[PDB]
């Protein structure tokens, strides 16, 4: 089942040691993906520790990329924090 993280938890995972981000209320651990992302490391770094949904959507991402992203899900944003960012 669901493992939840608050915004304040996720915020700490903002650097090379541990990079997490949020897309559509899911929490992604990208620590090892940074080196692999076709769009490069820096754009991810820029977003690390918070909601990156609109940047992810704005740039565009293929169905293949969206399927790939599910492999990094570690949990979901706590329900009480959903109103403090958009799904
Ligand atoms: C777990 C999440 C992510 C996955 C799996 C992922 C995967 C990919 C993949 C596979 C591509 C190659 C093109 C495509 O398939 O559409 C791509 C390109 C790109 N990604 Fe991501 N991405 C992720 C998150 C992000 C985020 C959050 C941003 C921005 C902050 C970003 C910015 C870019 C850029 C700028 C490109 C280049 C677009 C192009 O090829 O022309 N990505 N990403």
UniProtKB/Swiss-Prot annotation:
Gene Ontology cellular component annotations, sorted alphabetically: endoplasmic reticulum membrane; intracellular membrane-bounded organelle
Signal among keywords: no
UniProt superkingdom: Eukaryota
Keyword Ion transport: no
Domain Cytochrome b5 heme-binding: 2-78
Family: Belongs to the cytochrome b5 family.
Its job: Cytochrome b5 is a membrane-bound hemoprotein functioning as an electron carrier for several membrane-bound oxygenases.
Stated name of the protein: Cytochrome b5
Originating species: Sus scrofa
Portion of the parent chain present: 8 to 94 of 134
């Amino acid at each position: 089942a669901v493992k939840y993280y608050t915004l304040e938890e996720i915020q700490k995972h903002n650097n090379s040691k541990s990079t997490w981000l949020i897309l559509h209320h899911k929490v992604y651990d990208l620590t090892k993906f940074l080196e692999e992302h076709p769009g490069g490391e820096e754009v991810l770094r820029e977003q690390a520790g918070g909601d990156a949904t609109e940047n992810f959507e704005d740039v565009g991402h293929s169905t293949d990329a969206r399927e790939l992203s599910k492999t990094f899900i570690i949990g979901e944003l706590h329900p009480d924090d959903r109103s403090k960012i958009a799904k």
